[PDB]
Design a protein around this ligand. Structure first.
Ligand SMILES: [Zn+2]
Lengths: 730, 71, 104
């Protein structure tokens, strides 16, 4: 700045520097900027006296000039530096309307009143004086902004209307009107104002505003009519008209999608794509500013076209349009994710892996990309390295919870839940309140449920039922737990025939009724957002009807499941529900045929639990029909796809018992006993019996002690097993 | 205690809270205000009993709870 | 500010004060320390609320006990916190609600 001082003309501008070079003359604003920068730098340097001296120099030099007011503002700033509020107030009060930068000085007046003295009335009157002394739209708009800052929306709207009356059209100002009216939530008068504007000599920008407003608050038909009326214009070659038509076409396509007309939406999106193609051709040379925005808009248009094609189940054109959108914009993570998800949907692991690798190269964490890659390589049955990827992501970002949830699911299918708690450790280490995080609570509930303590898992889930994201999944899990806590085969009768008298307790029926009531209460809490959500809600309402154990309700659920299956082809949950309905109502051969059909389809990463229930029920049917071989095959299949399915292990133990495979039966029963958290005394009875038969007396005694500690009243175990094992020790 | 008893108790505990706080949780019963209720605090947290607050005991209490919270 | 105005909006909604409710969401949306997703959530909730109902609505010292202004000139005053409590609610408290010093 001192070198700048030595620059020609930087000493007393107007000192008769007869250089005859009035083309490089130091502009007054530039010189004032130099001096103010020097003053600020010296103030940062602590040279308060030197800064004051330079300020006095500027005041002395620039008196009578246009920029002089700014100097006084800086002087007022110095007062704010010194804390002398009254001095700054007086200095800015000296500023009059005739001088330039008056609006800045009076705005600083208003800011000083607002921040320090908090005089709302004075804050209002400052802008009122601004408006009165200079009756221009700028002053009125500033007054409206001031009112909106003091939260007086009605007077703000009045000031805005005065602004838009001072200049009757003013162009952009009119649009501001609507936004003001849309910000104060005066929607009805906003709609009336848009209609009044549109009625006479206004361009389709207000048409776009009215269409957007009508879409926002659900009047689809009026928005569609307005959009069609505005789009009836001739295809003008003007670039601005092209952009306006493109955005109107996109909004109309969204309107059509909202009101369920897919073909019309696709046609509108195609027209928008053509318009955006013309725009991209023109703008690259006609407007350097809009090139990235137009490219992104074209990418969004292509993405929407592909998404609606997916909704129409045309996957090839969807892939093509995602490729086009990625060509338009290569940095769109959402489009990359959608392309990977479709590649997974088309059962093409290679392309999905390529997209996941590209996305992970783009961003290392990218939780969802980790999800897709881990699921893909889990389909490869490379469990250890997928678990490694999830564990690395979690150890890098312990705050992550959805990754933690998928890790819990993968570990459960891997039968390695023992490593689950340690993650919680550093999950607790990052934040002392992490126990209050909904995601951590949901993951903890999932782990507890998978280990076989439904009540405490449900309690943990409760704290996450109110989350914006985790709420829906938490409610789903609570419904599943309440409807069937024992995790037994719904409709299966391999062990129900073995539970003829144990199920006669009325307390069981009372608990079932209470759980059904609680599940029905929880159903009202759910708020489905898409058609899939409504389908899921209907499916679980049908499950609740099944749990009520009312024959009319069961048959109604059967009819509803049949209707849903007819509606959506190859829908696995619907098939499982209707098959269970046939099973319970003793339509056993129909259930057998249905499960034969179900087993033909291959397992997927979304309906795994439905697949496991289906396979378990089919194994039940086979065991009932004495088809041990294929039941064993299906049970091995289920255990291959999940390594901690207690019911599958119990079935295997029963099968090995039927063949007197006492060692294998004992191993399977032990595994089931361990994974059930020893809450089923009958399994312990079978396991102790199998140890006793296999001549392993001490292990039988241990299991008998465990069962009796779990249930001191459980009969037929002291004598039939424990006493006989004790007598055979020597 | 009976397992069925534990299940019944859990179901009643879950049923309690929803109707306990539906009075202010939602508007008119159809609009859910979970977005705005997040800044509220538990009932017992905003209960104060009329007890003298001497400097020493209050300081010791707040110091102990801060040390427990701080890590 | 976010906690203050969220609580104010909640009170307005629970007390049928929709004018103050609108005045609350205006500042809540206009707050500069909010994420874009949070702004969208607030805007959507306000849209639902104000489609359901109309947005239009229907210093003195402050009493510590109930926040109402102390209209009366004679009023119980604390010996420490220097903030008054109304004569109709002094007898209820054995210590000053603001500072928990003994009443007197
Ligand atoms: Zn006091």
């Amino acid at each position: 700045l001192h070198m700048a001082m030595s620059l020609p003309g930087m000493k007393r501008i107007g000192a008769s520097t007869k250089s005859k070079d009035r083309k490089t003359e130091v502009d007054t604003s530039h010189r004032l900027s130099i001096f103010l920068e020097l003053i600020d730098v010296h103030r940062l340097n602590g040279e308060q006296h030197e800064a004051t001296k330079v300020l006095q120099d500027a005041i002395h030099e620039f008196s009578g000039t246009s920029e002089e007011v700014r100097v006084t503002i800086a002087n007022a700033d110095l007062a704010l530096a010194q804390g002398d509020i009254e001095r700054a107030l007086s200095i800015l009060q000296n500023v009059t309307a005739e001088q330039p930068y008056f609006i800045e000085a009076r705005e600083k007046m208003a800011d000083i009143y607002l921040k320090h003295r908090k005089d709302k009335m004075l804050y209002i009157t400052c802008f009122r004086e601004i408006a009165e002394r200079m009756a221009n739209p700028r002053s009125f708009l500033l007054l409206g902004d001031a009112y909106m800052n003091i939260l007086e929306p009605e007077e703000a709207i009045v000031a805005y209307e005065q602004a838009l009356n001072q200049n009757p059209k003013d162009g952009t100002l009119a649009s501001k009107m609507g936004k003001a009216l849309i910000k104060t939530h005066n929607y009805s008068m906003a709609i009336t104002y848009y209609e009044a504007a549109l009625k006479t000599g206004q361009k389709n920008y207000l048409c776009y505003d009215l269409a957007e407003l009508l879409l926002k608050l659900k009047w689809y038909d009026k928005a569609e009519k307005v959009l069609q009326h505005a789009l009836a214009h001739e295809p003008v070659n003007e670039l601005s008209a092209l952009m306006e038509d493109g955005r109107c076409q996109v909004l109309l396509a969204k309107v059509y999608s909202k009101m369920e007309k897919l073909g019309d939406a696709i046609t509108a999106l195609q027209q928008a794509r053509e318009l955006q193609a013309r725009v991209l051709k023109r703008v690259q040379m006609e407007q350097p500013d809009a090139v990235p925005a137009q490219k992104h808009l074209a990418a969004e248009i292509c993405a929407e076209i592909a998404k609606h094609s997916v909704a129409q189940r045309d996957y090839e054109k969807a892939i093509k349009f995602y490729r086009e959108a990625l060509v338009h914009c290569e940095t769109d993570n959402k489009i990359m994710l959608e392309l990977a998800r479709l590649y997974l949907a088309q059962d093409d692991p290679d392309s999905c892996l390529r997209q996941c690798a590209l996305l992970l190269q783009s961003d290392q964490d990218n939780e969802a990309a980790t999800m897709m890659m881990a699921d893909l390589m889990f389909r490869k049955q490379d469990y250890e390295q997928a678990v490694f990827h999830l564990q690395q992501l979690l150890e890098r970002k312990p705050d992550n919870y959805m990754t933690l949830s998928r890790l819990i699911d993968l570990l459960r299918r891997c039968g390695k839940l023992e490593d689950v708690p340690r993650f919680f450790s550093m999950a607790e280490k990052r934040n002392s309140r992490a126990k209050l995080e909904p995601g951590f609570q949901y993951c903890k509930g999932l782990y507890l449920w998978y280990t076989g303590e439904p009540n405490d898992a449900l309690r943990h889930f409760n704290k996450a039922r109110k989350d914006r994201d985790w709420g829906q999944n938490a409610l789903y899990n609570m419904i599943e737990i309440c409807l069937n806590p024992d995790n037994e085969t719904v409709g299966g009768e391999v062990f129900e025939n073995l539970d003829g008298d144990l199920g006669n307790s009325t307390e069981k029926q009372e608990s079932v009724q209470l759980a059904v009531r609680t599940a029905e209460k929880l159903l009202k809490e759910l708020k489905p957002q898409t058609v899939q959500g409504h389908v899921q809600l209907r499916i679980m309402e049908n499950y609740c009807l099944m749990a009520t154990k009312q024959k009319s309700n069961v048959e109604q659920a059967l009819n509803t499941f049949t209707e849903i299956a007819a509606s959506e082809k190859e829908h696995i949950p619907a098939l499982l529900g209707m098959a269970t309905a046939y099973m319970i109502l003793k339509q056993t051969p129909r259930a057998r045929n249905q499960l034969k059909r179900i087993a033909k389809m291959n397992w997927n990463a979304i309906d795994a639990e439905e697949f496991e229930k289906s396979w378990l029920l089919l194994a039940d049917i086979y065991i009932q029909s004495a088809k041990y071989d294929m039941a064993e095959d299906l049970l091995k299949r289920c255990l291959r796809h999940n390594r901690s399915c207690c019911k599958a292990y119990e079935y295997m133990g029963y099968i090995m018992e039927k063949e007197q495979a006492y060692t294998d039966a004992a191993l399977n029963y032990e595994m089931a006993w361990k994974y059930s958290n020893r809450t089923n005394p009958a399994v312990g009875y079978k396991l102790a019996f199998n140890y006793l038969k296999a001549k392993r007396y001490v292990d039988s005694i241990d299991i008998c002690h465990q069962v009796l500690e779990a249930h001191p009243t459980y009969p037929k175990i002291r004598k039939d097993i424990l006493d006989k094992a004790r007598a055979s020790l020597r | 205690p009976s397992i069925q008893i534990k299940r019944v108790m859990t179901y009643r505990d879950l049923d309690n809270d929803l109707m306990k706080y539906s009075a202010i949780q939602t508007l008119d019963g159809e609009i859910d205000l979970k977005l705005l209720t997040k800044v509220l605090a538990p009932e017992h947290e905003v209960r104060e009993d009329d007890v003298g607050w001497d400097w020493d005991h209050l300081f010791t209490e707040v110091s102990s709870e801060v040390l427990t919270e701080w890590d | 500010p976010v906690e203050i105005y969220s609580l104010l909006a909640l009170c307005a909604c629970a007390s049928r004060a929709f004018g103050t409710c609108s005045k609350a969401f205006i500042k809540l949306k206009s707050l500069e320390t909010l994420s874009s997703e949070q702004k969208q959530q607030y805007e959507d909730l306000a849209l639902e609320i104000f489609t359901k109902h109309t947005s239009k609505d229907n210093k003195l010292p402050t009493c510590v006990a109930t926040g109402s202004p102390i209209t009366e000139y004679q009023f119980w005053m604390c010996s420490v916190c220097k903030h008054g409590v109304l004569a109709q609610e002094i007898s209820h408290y054995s210590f000053c609600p603001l500072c928990h010093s003994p009443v007197g």
